[PDB]
Amino acid sequence: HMEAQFFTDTGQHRDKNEDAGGIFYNQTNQQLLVLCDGMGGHKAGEVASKFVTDELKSRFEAENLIEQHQAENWLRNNIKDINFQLYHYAQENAEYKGMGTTCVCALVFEKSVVIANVGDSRAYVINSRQIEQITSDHSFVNHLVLTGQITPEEAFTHPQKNIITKVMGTDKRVSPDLFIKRLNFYDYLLLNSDGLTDYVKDNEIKRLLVKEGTIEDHGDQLMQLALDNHSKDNVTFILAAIEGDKV
């Protein structure tokens, strides 16, 4: 496990916080990082994001040991099952129909992390020289950027800029993206909702994290930066320190 902390804020421009997440431990104290952005454009976004977070917490705490070679399958299978359960929970309740959430999550190992992603929340690794986004946004504007139809600068003002193209809960099937990332030579692992990176640029995050400070120092400063940039969304992230391999 890593030293890690969860940070969330409703933001100045939202009535409710539909983001969710947490840092959970299984029976041998392995660590699972979870972050979910519940959909505000649809009903009951906080129900959906906390449904997925609660399910991942309960399922992970019931495990004794998930070794690195089992992690991709554990995450893929549990995300698919949770999506299935959430879809039918929504179908069975008219006030929830259409609800959904992103999910980015990470199982932590000594030398690596295994990440699953559905939606436009993000995972990054950062060191003093670079910041690498591990995940790829399942968003309509990312589709437009990757197919050459708009520039990445246009995506921030596009009328469909908040639309996402893979979401938990909205269909009985989902295909999460799975990533394995070696942690060697990185300093921080960051999971975040788009309320952060829609308003704070990658190089701003890198510059903040290369400064001295504890995880709580960095997280409070990073949260204040998103708010100073007038984020119009809920802002949530987990910041985790990667321990340099000792001599």
Binding residues vs Mg ion (CB under 5 A) = 18, 37-38, 40, 120, 187, 193-195, 233
Q: How many CB atoms lie within 10 A of CB 202?
A: 15
Length of the chain as a residue count: 247
Least distance in angstroms from the C-beta of 67 to Mg ion: 26
User: d(Cα 118, Cα 155) in Å, to the nearest integer?
Assistant: 19
User: Is 37 among the annotated ligand-binding positions?
Assistant: yes
Select the residue whose beta carbon is closest to Mg ion and give its number: 194
Residues 6+ apart with CB under 8 A from 151: 145
Least distance in angstroms from the C-beta of 195 to Mg ion: 5
Task: Considering the complex, state which of residue 100 and residue 176 has its C-beta at the smaller distance from Mg ion.
Answer: 100
Task: Considering the complex, state which of residue 63 and residue 187 has its C-beta at the smaller distance from Mg ion.
Answer: 187
Task: Considering the complex, state which of residue 33 and residue 48 has its C-beta at the smaller distance from Mg ion.
Answer: 48
- Sign of CA pseudo-dihedral 145, 150, 156, 161: negative
User: Is 211 among the annotated ligand-binding positions?
Assistant: yes
Let me know: does 28 contact 67? Beta carbons within 8 Å.
no
Least distance in angstroms from the C-beta of 139 to Mg ion: 6
Which candidate, 202, 203, 210, 191, places its Cα nearest to that of 117? Answer: 191
Task: Considering the complex, state which of residue 169 and residue 195 has its C-beta at the smaller distance from Mg ion.
Answer: 195
User: Is 233 among the annotated ligand-binding positions?
Assistant: yes
Task: Considering the complex, state which of residue 71 and residue 134 has its C-beta at the smaller distance from Mg ion.
Answer: 134
Cα angle, residue 84 at apex, residues 80 and 88 outer, rounded to 5°: 170
Q: What share of the chain is helix, strand, coil (3-state, %, to 5)?
A: 30, 25, 40
User: Is 194 among the annotated ligand-binding positions?
Assistant: yes
Instruction: List residues forming the annotated binding site for Mn(2+).
Output: 18-19, 37-38, 120, 188, 194, 198, 209, 211, 218, 233
Instruction: List residues forming the annotated binding site.
Output: 18-19, 37-38, 120, 187-188, 194, 198, 209, 211, 218, 233
Instruction: List residues forming the annotated binding site for Mg(2+).
Output: 18, 37-38, 120, 187, 194, 198, 233
